């Protein structure tokens, strides 16, 4: 058992519009695929529902979660949820700045207008309170209070335009000060007019059942494979079909990197909400978070919709990983996790961890020749036997599929000790690179486990005595054969 929210409570924490999530229950069930979302600004929900246009990848400024501009994407990112974080505000502002120019005509900015209703939705949420009146240069304004201490807001009586100014004695994160001025929000073009943007729905992941992916493969490309005499070329050809129609992803103009089944899922999803009434257009605008490799975010709570149409919400990352382990990557569904995980993402230097089964095994499996070299490459940052890089290429020789398992284990337990020998006398030389020395004491450890593993499969230090390293050929391999007996 694992502590996760369900139904109503979970939907509540998700941020999605209720009607919308229901429409999503449908698609989950139909396509038998798990739909996982990323947190949605809770102050964005009513805006989304009222049909405010959401935002694409062409807009990276964050949305606000406080003040009169809650829910929208403020031009001035110090009014956003990243308020106070000088470095973030800056990348935010640079992002908006770019959006306004690198897409001139498509994305712009306009004054915030809080209608009579939003003011009250905000009054409810206890975000802002409509204050006392005030007049300036012949115009009527009503203050808007907030527990914010850097800024002060007021709204216009005529056009309902909200403005803001810094407070006496206070300084912006960017160390500024100014007097009265409209609050601008990121807008998009829609039939020649500028319409305000709000958060969108970001898919964290999508996990479709293998069967569901099959329907993506052409019933002819498959038969051709399935119908191959040689199995060794059968598997590969099947795996390549899986890669091609389910795994592989490609960069798209505005939907970022996604596969084709994802593009359809995307379309389906937007269709679903359009049918309920959402008139803002698309509510999902791009691929999933598992393909966001440069700047990978990491949320505490993911909102899940399983093929049953049941709402789940993980409480924390570790939990998110267990839910995916026990109901997805473990129950016949297609899943791939972000390639940046377990590494230092290049963009934001993020270091998000995830459970990788290939690594847990690494300890007992000896390395391929490339891994050996590639590990001398990257190892060659903090800074002449090629026999080992050959032996390792020998251990994993495809021309083994013509021998019996017994034969296989034999020759491999040998080819191993072989490289375990070369590595041995290399460490017997000079400790050239103090820590290069570790990589080998390590390989040696791996080589040891692998071998001592292949032996127990049939019948280490022990047998590592009655063997040759002298001169050379099919003389050592000889004494060996007998030792096993």
């Amino acid at each position: 058992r694992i502590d996760v929210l369900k139904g109503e409570k979970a939907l509540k924490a998700s941020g999605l519009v209720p009607e919308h999530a229901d429409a999503f229950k449908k698609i989950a069930r139909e396509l038998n695929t798990y739909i996982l979302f990323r947190p949605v600004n809770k102050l964005a929900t009513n805006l989304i529902k009222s049909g405010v246009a959401t935002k694409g990848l062409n807009v990276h400024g964050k949305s606000s979660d406080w003040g009169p501009v809650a829910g929208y994407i403020p031009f001035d990112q110090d009014l956003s949820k990243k308020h106070g974080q000088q470095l973030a505000v800056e990348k935010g502002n640079l992002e908006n700045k770019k959006s306004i120019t690198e897409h001139e005509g498509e994305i712009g900015k306009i004054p915030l207008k809080l209608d009579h209703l939003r003011i009250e939705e905000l009054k409810e949420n206890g975000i802002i309170l409509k204050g006392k009146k005030e007049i300036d240069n012949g115009k009527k304004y009503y203050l808007l209070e907030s527990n914010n201490q850097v800024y002060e807001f007021r709204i216009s009586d005529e056009n309902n335009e909200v403005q803001y100014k810094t407070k006496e004695g206070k300084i912006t994160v960017l160390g500024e000060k100014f007097n009265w001025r409209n609050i601008e929000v990121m807008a998009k073009n829609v039939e020649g007019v500028l319409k305000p943007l709000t958060a969108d729905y970001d898919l964290f992941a999508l996990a479709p059942s293998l069967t569901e992916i099959k329907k993506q493969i052409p019933q002819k490309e498959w038969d051709k494979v399935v119908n191959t005499p040689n199995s060794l070329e059968k598997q590969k050809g099947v795996t390549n079909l899986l890669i091609k129609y389910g795994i592989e992803r490609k960069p798209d103009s505005t939907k970022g990197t996604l596969s084709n089944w994802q593009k359809q899922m995307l379309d389906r999803l937007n269709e679903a909400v359009k049918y309920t009434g959402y008139t803002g257009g698309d509510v999902v605008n791009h691929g999933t978070e598992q393909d966001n490799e440069e700047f990978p975010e990491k949320d505490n709570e993911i909102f899940i919709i399983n093929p049953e149409g049941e709402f789940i919400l993980t409480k924390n990352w570790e939990m998110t990983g267990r839910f995916i382990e026990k109901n997805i990557t473990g129950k016949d569904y297609l899943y791939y996790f972000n390639r940046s995980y377990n590494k230092i993402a290049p963009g934001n230097k993020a270091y998000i961890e995830w459970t990788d089964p290939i690594t847990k095994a690494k300890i007992n499996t000896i390395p391929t020749s490339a891994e050996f070299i590639k590990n001398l490459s990257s190892i060659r940052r903090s800074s002449s036997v090629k026999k080992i890089a050959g032996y390792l290429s020998d251990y994993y020789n495809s021309a083994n599929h013509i021998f019996s398992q017994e034969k296989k284990r034999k020759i491999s337990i040998f080819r191993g000790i072989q490289a375990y020998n070369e590595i041995e006398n290399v460490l017997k030389s000079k400790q050239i690179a103090p820590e290069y020395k570790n990589y080998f004491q390590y390989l040696k450890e791996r080589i040891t486990n692998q071998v001592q593993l292949l032996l127990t499969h049939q019948k280490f230090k022990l047998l590592y005595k009655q063997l040759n390293f002298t001169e050379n050929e099919t003389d050592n391999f000889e004494v060996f054969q007998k030792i096993i007996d």
Binding site: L232, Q235, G330, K331, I373, K374, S377, A389, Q405, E406
Partner: protein
């Protein structure tokens, strides 16, 4: 990537009895293989003739680097392969077992017999552990 190049240039120092990083086409195949590639004798020839029309047969880094600077275009799919392995490995032990292979198969429409299954495992298996680790899955998919 700096490593992309770092790796190639890394292997170059393992088999040159020249010292000037100018190996022959005799070892060109020796390098391309110890570096995870299995070229055919025909390919090692038609290539080392166009680019290396020098008339010496000695290949250095700039030459070798530029050659590899082509192959690693579509083959780099390693990523998808590694992701594929993980799809099969339903229990996350790091190895692909026959049972698991059965699942991926029976779900993709190809109903298989426990006979044929254990047959596929033994095909791809290379050290006879009765299972397929990523390294093997890689050969079986590249090789």
């Amino acid at each position: 990537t700096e490593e992309q190049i770092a790796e190639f240039k890394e292997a170059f120092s393992l088999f040159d009895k020249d010292g000037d990083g100018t190996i022959t086409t005799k070892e060109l195949g020796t390098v391309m293989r110890s570096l995870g590639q299995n070229p055919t004798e025909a390919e090692l020839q038609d290539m080392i003739n166009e680019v290396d029309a020098d008339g010496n047969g000695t290949i250095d880094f700039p030459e070798f680097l530029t050659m590899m600077a082509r192959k690693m275009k579509d083959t780099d799919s390693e990523e998808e392969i590694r992701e594929a392995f993980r799809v099969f490995d339903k229990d996350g032990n790091g190895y692909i077992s026959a049972a698991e292979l059965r699942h991926v198969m029976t779900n993709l429409g190809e109903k298989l017999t426990d006979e044929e299954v254990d047959e596929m495992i033994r095909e791809a298996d290379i050290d006879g552990d009765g299972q397929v680790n990523y390294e093997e899955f890689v050969q079986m998919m590249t090789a």
